[PDB]
Symmetry: C3
């Protein structure tokens, strides 16, 4: 199933009939960082498997729902259970849910992820406001837009220089200052590692030389689809570890340690994003 | 359809029956840089869709013809409407037209493209004679030669150290000097970005550190297929912008601006390549 | 055919019925470096084409056998005829033979390859004990583990920081010292170039800047599958040339020259690996 105008329209039609919500904001939340979705008011949960043309996710299993409702008086749509390219989903499967968001009325997309720290100033538990990226899959002929262009959504050759909205970064930082946690908030450049293996010690050393501040396995595909169709983006990484220090000390990373950092910061991130949603222009 | 000896032979047979031209030179021209094709003498236009085993191009649409005839007393074959890998064409679809050129008798391939400038000496409107490349798709398991080797055309493991003929570069520069436009002509290393998004500001900064002079989304696949089967290559980039300066000044690039640079230099490039064709050893 | 638990089990069942050997050690040998396989004692040769669920290799042709028997009193299984990703084999085809080794009882995998030298200390004929890697395909969305995770074999997100066992490196060096050829033995970081074109002169210059000591077209996929399922690895590169010196002197590389270096070092490598097998803890 191609992520074209007709197929996205069929999915949006189903959603509109079932939910009655016309959302202005979309959210995609990282692993262990989804508690806000359970607090959406007057909400409606729609399993992906019920929506025409949504990608099949039963090989991976686990949760996969679209959730619509209100937060802070604002109408939102959330993806609960993200699709990642290391699972084998195609370009067309990643793009269709974002293009459905566009047809539903979404103008701003807020995204969180877990990532590894490269810059020496980053510690476990820090947040990074993403200001740009290095897209190794895109340089290497695996960009999410490889294929025919869907002209109704955007241009053949997008410019990504303003993909990460500067005013949204400034609002996120302002709110951190108001609540006295700005000491945890940095800005930086995100490297996309296709995955699913964590960056090796020598890959980490290379990324330091190349100007990367953080590295992870998600987010860049969604950012590119959103920028192509005119949706503004705020993307925030939660830092699980510093991969450069770990290489110098021969210390390992694993999914258990990552999820423990997520649990440590989940409630603060929930409060922060609730306020961002409330304050969006 | 595999780009093998039998399938390439069937296409060449059709072409020979229809055109009567036995070409020694092939040309592939960049977007907005194809006016020379409309001036081929005693010419024959063959739509791709009519040629056995040529790749299907109707999803992308737009022009797609093989044009044969004479320029400067020399017999040539041109591709009008290039196939680019960001459109989703496979390795086999890119390679078949170049291998048909080989069977028709082509010994020299001349290629032009539009590209972004990385080296600080490059301005919009400059030309770069390509002397080597950095093939991000090839390092990342998307080389145009991934697949079984077609032994009739070339070896399993090609050496690319002489892919860009030095004497052809020297002839191109000599002709620029004769016509007093050598101040526009540089040499440099070309980075292949799979595309279709333009290099991001932070990707541009990385490429500067890695020794890249220019970056674009084409050319390297065709060069590799030509080198594999013993065809000599001259490749020239027309510079649309300097991506490093644009990053320092927060200035955007887009296809409209690219095509305007192409229109500004089209007539000079046409005159230059006509003389190169005439003077080839 | 997916490299899952059921399919790997069917292949292992066939092998066990035919060979009667329960191996503790697996070996994968580079081109021209397979003489040790012909000296396995009380051996059994099983063509890949006869084993249920093994990948089809008839397009490439050439040899493809699993060989079981004894070396130095130890039970081993060897792959004779390696599968390389530049031939077009999928992730699932590369992984299945390694996962069969795991089900047969393999705890240690020994691997050899031919590679290009980047570090200025490396000459043709030198050996490099691999201590880490830079996986360009993995960064670029072509990691061997892209796809659903096979949970019976290992975790969704592997850590590769200890993929190259330190004690096995130390044993290999100890044996070189005992036989007075330690002057040929170095350690280093291996860059994976998907291939099949040799690294270009400008790619070589880039790899020097990025901290790479050697570059080749194999090994990293097998290492990752082995690490995922808990098999310890020793990987050794035989250096065919120094690509940085060749770029400075405009000298070419080719498969003939590579195979001549293999023939020059084959007997010494055979003796070294026989002793390593005998001495493994
Ligand atoms: C998610 C993650 C955590 C730590 C390091 N690297 C990553 O990709
Ligand atoms: C064609 C092009 C123009 C300007 C920058 N980058 C590119 O790839
Ligand atoms: C196998 C090989 C030999 C020399 C240089 N590069 C390579 O990949």
């Amino acid at each position: 199933v191609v992520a074209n105008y007709e197929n996205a329209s069929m999915a949006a039609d189903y959603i509109k009939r079932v939910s009655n919500v016309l959302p202005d904001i979309g959210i995609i939340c990282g692993s262990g960082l989804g508690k806000l979705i359970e607090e959406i008011e007057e909400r409606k949960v729609i399993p992906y498997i019920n929506i025409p043309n949504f990608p099949k996710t039963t090989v991976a299993g686990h949760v996969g729902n679209l959730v619509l409702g209100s937060v802070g008086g604002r109408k939102i749509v959330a993806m609960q259970g993200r699709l990642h390219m290391y699972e084998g989903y195609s370009n067309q499967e990643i793009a269709l849910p974002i293009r459905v968001m566009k047809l539903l009325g979404v103008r701003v997309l807020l995204i969180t992820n877990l990532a590894g720290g490269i810059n020496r100033k980053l510690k476990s538990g820090d947040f990074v406001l993403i200001k740009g990226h290095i897209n190794f899959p895109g340089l290497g002929l695996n960009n999410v837009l490889v294929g025919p262009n869907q002209d109704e959504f955007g241009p053949r050759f997008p410019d990504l220089s303003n993909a990460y909205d500067r005013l949204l970064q400034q609002l996120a930082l302002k709110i951190a200052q108001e609540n006295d946690f700005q000491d945890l908030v940095h800005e930086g450049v995100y490297a996309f590692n296709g995955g699913p293996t964590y960056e090796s010690p020598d890959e980490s050393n290379m990324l330091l030389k190349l100007g990367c501040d953080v590295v992870g396995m998600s987010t860049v595909p969604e950012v590119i689809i959103a920028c192509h169709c005119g949706i503004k983006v705020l993307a925030v990484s939660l830092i699980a570890n510093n991969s450069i220090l770990d290489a110098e000390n021969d210390v390992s990373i694993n999914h258990e340690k990552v999820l423990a950092v997520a649990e440590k910061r989940a409630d603060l991130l929930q409060m922060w994003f609730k306020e961002i949603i409330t304050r969006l222009p």
